[PDB]
């Protein structure tokens, strides 16, 4: 089997040589004629109370009004972010959940976790009470991140090293994406709804298409497990957060690692990464009970958002980019602007 | 008319918010009174043989156990529907007040990897506060296994030769001293890492049990009482 090793080595060094040849110049010196981003630290405008256990996941939706928060008590709470009033408090069959999703329409909500099942509920029903709409089962591992792309098909990331794209009505699996060797922990959808990227515990982010089951591209460059992922608002770049206390911005077209955000005073892992609307500010939640905002051009620490007593679990930015929601393990959601 | 309608719907939204907040506050008392337990162990460790008369009341990802002792409900988890990697879903169990860690003391390799798993659970950053109730399952199997003479303890642990039974150890009646020496050697092998990295915060509660003993619920009740008392004493900055 020495010929297989030789072929793998020759393809690997061909990839390395192509990446080196296409790396004509780094982008650190490219962003040299631009002004630095000032200190734009923000204050907690509202704090959401009511959860009885730690908050793990969170989502916004198209309108920047209806937050979703998932707790390990077994609660999916939908919050009105403006006036601070809870709208629905859905109880769950399995208390251990790690993901929640809000559809582009306001009709459906989703959840999943250690039960290996993605449960979706209606919101605007005829009777007026929330109930278990559908029960997508078929994963042999824990769900980490489920994301809606429409009202009829969903994409889910599981710990069984495989991602899936399900259809809602028939309850079957439309496509199955395999090729990771570690637990897939994060999943982000491109704005055009044609591609997505999944970060795993392989120090690897794989970019997949939704029409075909094949893997479009693979990105390496981390040292530990990837916990968070997010496309650029343009859709031709993405940022990955990992446990090596470094964020890494990759670009789609060059298949190259571009920017490494790291510091010598940080050793804690990175749990949640979300971009701003313009793509300049990069908000990353850390395990040192704080969050850090960087810029995507100078790779400098723009500011620090503090005020959590436990580790951060989820970080989100509205589609219009106004409010930033941080949910940590002290049962509190903080809204920033 | 539009202003009246918007005031009416604002009042209705406030009323619904107050109602569901009252429901959450009502469920809070029931939630923070039943103690949660997370059970860990190997395939041959005797995972489901801890509690037998509450094992059957009459999904496969998580198996559940409800059992009530002295008007206190105990809500027991065991996770077996996932894969062998466990560094990511063990962070979902930060808030659990006790880890029931069951060790097979008969088959050995097995005890070394159980010891390594105990090291990983004890030294984990998000499990650094959780107390571990450690069960030494299959004590009878160990009792005939150490008297069989075919398996030598020295081969799998070179430090057994320079070991003696502790004076604080109370041997059970009706057994030779060598099985007591073996059991307390295993207990000390677990306690040497149980009492090395934890500077307060959490300690272990070693217990001996088999497939016949039916008093494990009482031991779990006493351990949980000690755990909650210690947490209350620590949260009042009483060092």
């Amino acid at each position, epitope marked *: 089997l020495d010929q297989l090793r030789q072929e793998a080595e020759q393809l690997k060094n061909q990839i390395r040589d192509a990446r080196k040849a296409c790396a004509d110049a780094t982008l650190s010196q490219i962003t040299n004629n631009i002004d630095p981003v000032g200190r734009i630290q923000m204050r907690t405008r509202r704090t959401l109370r009511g959860h009885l256990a730690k908050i793990y996941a969170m989502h916004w939706g198209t309108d920047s009004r209806l937050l979703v928060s998932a707790s390990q008590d077994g609660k999916l709470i939908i919050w009105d972010s403006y006036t601070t009033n809870k709208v629905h408090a859905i109880p769950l069959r399995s208390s251990w959940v790690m993901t929640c999703a809000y559809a582009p329409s306001g009709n459906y909500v989703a959840c999943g976790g250690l039960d290996n099942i993605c449960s979706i509920y209606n919101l605007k029903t005829r009777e007026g009470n929330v109930r278990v709409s559908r029960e997508l089962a078929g994963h042999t591992g824990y769900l980490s991140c489920c994301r809606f792309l429409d009202d009829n098909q969903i994409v889910t990331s599981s710990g069984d090293t495989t991602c899936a794209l399900w259809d809602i009505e028939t309850g079957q699996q439309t496509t199955t994406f395999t090729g990771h060797t570690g637990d897939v922990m994060s999943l982000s959808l491109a704005p055009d709804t044609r591609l997505f990227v999944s970060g795993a515990c392989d120090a690897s982010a794989k970019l997949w298409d939704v029409r075909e089951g094949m893997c479009r591209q693979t990105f390496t460059g981390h040292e530990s497990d990837i916990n968070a992922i997010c496309f650029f608002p343009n859709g031709n770049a993405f940022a990955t957060g990992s446990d090596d206390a470094t964020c890494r911005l990759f670009d789609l077209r060059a298949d190259q690692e571009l920017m490494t955000y790291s510091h010598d005073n940080i050793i804690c892992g990175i749990t949640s990464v979300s971009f701003s609307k313009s793509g300049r500010l990069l908000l990353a939640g850390y395990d040192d009970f704080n969050c850090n905002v960087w810029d995507a051009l100078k790779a400098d620490r723009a500011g620090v958002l503090a005020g959590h007593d436990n580790r951060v679990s989820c970080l989100g930015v509205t589609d219009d980019g106004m409010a930033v929601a941080t949910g940590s393990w002290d049962s509190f959601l903080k809204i920033w602007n | 008319s539009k202003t009246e309608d918007k005031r009416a719907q604002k009042r209705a939204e406030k009323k619904r918010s107050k109602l569901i907040d009252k429901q959450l506050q009502d469920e809070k008392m029931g939630y923070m009174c039943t103690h949660r337990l997370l059970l860990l162990g190997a395939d041959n460790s005797g995972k489901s043989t801890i509690v037998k008369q509450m094992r059957i009341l009459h999904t496969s990802g998580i198996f559940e156990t409800k059992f009530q002792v002295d008007k206190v409900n105990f809500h027991m988890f065991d996770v077996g529907g996932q894969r062998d990697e466990r560094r990511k879903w063990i962070q979902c169990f930060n808030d659990v007040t006790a880890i029931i860690f069951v060790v097979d003391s008969s088959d050995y390799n097995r005890l*070394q990897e159980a010891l390594n798993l105990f090291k990983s659970i004890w030294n984990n950053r998000w499990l650094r506060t959780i107390s571990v109730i450690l069960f030494l399952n299959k004590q009878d199997l160990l009792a005939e296994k150490v008297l069989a003479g075919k398996s030598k303890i020295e081969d799998y642990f070179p430090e057994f030769a320079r070991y003696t039974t502790p004076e604080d150890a109370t041997p059970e009646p009706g057994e030779d001293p060598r099985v007591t020496r073996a059991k307390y050697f295993i207990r000390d092998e677990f306690l040497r890492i149980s009492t090395a990295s934890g500077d307060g915060r959490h300690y272990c509660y070693p217990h001996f049990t088999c497939a016949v003993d039916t008093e494990n619920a009482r031991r779990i009740f006493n351990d949980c009482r000690d755990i909650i008392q210690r947490m209350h004493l620590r949260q009042y900055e009483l060092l």
Partner: nanobody
Amino acid sequence: QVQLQESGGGLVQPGGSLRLSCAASGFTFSNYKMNWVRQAPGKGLEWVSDISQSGASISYTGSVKGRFTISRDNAKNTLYLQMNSLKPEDTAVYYCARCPAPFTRDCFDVTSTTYAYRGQGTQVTV
């Protein structure tokens, strides 16, 4: 890319001391701690030894105590396993692995051939 190339071992005569070498590229070698794991034919993955970041805290399993030694140099970014003579029951394939968190002392590096940060390994027989 993080990779752990391995060399040494195999057709080894008994009575001689050899040095199984692991060369690490990718991760910074100083910030992490490393493990040696072995797999026998017909048996599962078995942890053999572990060494911390500074090399002060070294731990072994019971079956290798007093005979095998493990060490590492961060300046050369290399790790070594010194073995004296052999054992008739050590015919196995050896992997050098790393738990995926730098500044921790807890690791989960035994899998059913599904772990990521683990080298190809070298097979040694007597």
